[PDB]
Amino acid sequence: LTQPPSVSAAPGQKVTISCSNVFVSWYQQFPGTAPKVVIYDTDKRPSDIPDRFSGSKSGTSATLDITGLQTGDEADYYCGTVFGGGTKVTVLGQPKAAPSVTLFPPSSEELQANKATLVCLISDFYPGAVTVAWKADSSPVKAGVETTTPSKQSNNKYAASSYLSLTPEQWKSHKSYSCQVTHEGSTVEKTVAP
Amino acid sequence: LTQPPSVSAAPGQKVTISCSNSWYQQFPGTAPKVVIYDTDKDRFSGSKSGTSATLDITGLQTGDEADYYCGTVFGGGTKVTPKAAPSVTLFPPSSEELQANKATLVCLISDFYPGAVTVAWKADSSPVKAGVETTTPSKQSNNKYAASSYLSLTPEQWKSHKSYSCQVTHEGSTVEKTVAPT
C-alpha cells in the first residue's frame, strides 16, 4: 500500500525500497515503458533480470533490495499484491541538495482583478523528487493545489512549483498560508500572509 | 501480451483496446489502478472473444486520457488520445526575499492546451537570458497544462530598471505581462 517517494545511492551502493501494510510483486517502470515484474511472490525473481534484485518481508512491511546500483536501474518501482505509491530510484552523480523554497503571495494586480494565486517556487534540489503540502491557517489544503513535475535545470539540479488558486476573500480570511516541501526526509516550511 | 501502441477517438464516442494471448489505467506520475478484473469488473466493458481481450470506454471523457495495460505479465501499453490559451502570471520578489538580499521573479504559465510553450524575458524591452530557467509542462487536474519560468536577480539589478517582463509563445499567439518595483 505505501512506499517512500524517493530512494537514492551512489553508483555501487545498495538501495532498499519499503512497501508497507501488506504475495508481494515488484514492478519496475521506466518512462513510456510498461511496468515489468522485477520480483514475484515476495522473494522469487524471474529469469533475465539480474541477481542484484532481491525481495524480502519482515512484518507488515515487505522490501525490495537493489545492490550494485547503476544508471540502468534509475526508474519508478511499485509494490503489488492493488499497487503501492511508487519509489523513484536515483543513481547519485552529484552532492544531494536541499531545495530552496520561495513562497510568493498574490500581487496587487491579481487581487485588483478578483483572482488570487500563491506560488511556491522549489528550486536547486537533487534528487528530483519532492512532496508538497499546503496549509491555510495551520489546517491542511489539497483543494486548489497544482504542482509541476520536477525538471532538470541548467546546473543539473531540479526545479518545480506548486500553486494554490483562491478567492481574494479566502486569502484575506486566513491570517496565514504555508508551503511545506519535503525532499529526502528533510522538510522546509515557508509561510505567507496578507 | 500485445497491444496497439495508441488508439484515437472523439469526445462523446467509444474507443476499443485489444490485448493478444485484467485491465489497468495509468495517468502520468501515478501507479496503475485496476479497472476491470478477470474479464468482468467506474463503468466500462471488458468482454473478450478468442485468444484476444478487449476493453471499451463507454463515455469518451477527457479524464480517461491515460495508458492502459492488460495483465494475466503486462501488455505493451495503449495510449488513449479543444484549444485553451495560457494564463501567464508574473510575480515580483517577495518582501521577505529582499530582506535576505536576494530577488526572484516567477512567470507562471497555466490552463493551456496543447502542452507546449516558449519563454523570453525583458528588462525595459532589452531581452535578457542571465539567470533564466524554464520548467517543462505537466498535465494538471483540469486536463489543461502548467509550466513556470523564473528570473534570478540582485535587489539592485531589479530596482535599477523601470520594468521587467516575461513573453510566453503558444501556437503562434504571444502573451506578455509586466512588473515594476513598488
Residue numbers in the entry:
A (entry chain A): 4 to 25, 29 to 87, 96 to 208
B (entry chain B): 4 to 24, 31 to 50, 57 to 87, 96 to 104, 109 to 209
Sentences from the study reporting this entry:
LCs were distributed in two groups: a set of eight amyloidogenic LCs responsible for severe cardiac involvement and symptoms in patients (hereafter, H LC), and a set of five non amyloidogenic LCs isolated from patients affected by multiple myeloma for which no amyloid aggregation or proteotoxicity was observed in patients (hereafter, M LC). The crystal structures were all refined to satisfactory refinement parameters; in all cases the LCs were dimeric, with an overall quaternary arrangement closely matching that of the previously reported LC dimers. VL and CL domains display very different structural properties in the seven crystal structures.
Each of the seven LCs crystallized in a different space group, with distinct crystal packing; the crystallographic resolutions achieved ranged from 2.70 Å (H7) to 1.65 Å (H9). In H6 and M8 dimers all six CDRs (three for each LC monomer) are traceable in the electron density; in H9 and H10 five out of six are traceable, in H7 three, and in H3 and M7 only two CRDs are traceable. In some cases (H6, H9, H10) CDR3 (residues 89–97) participates in the interface; both CDR3s in the H7 dimer lack electron density, while in M7 and M8 CDR3 residues are located far from the VL–VL interface. Firstly, and somewhat unexpectedly, the most temperature- and trypsin-sensitive LCs (H3, H6, H7, H9) could be successfully crystallized.
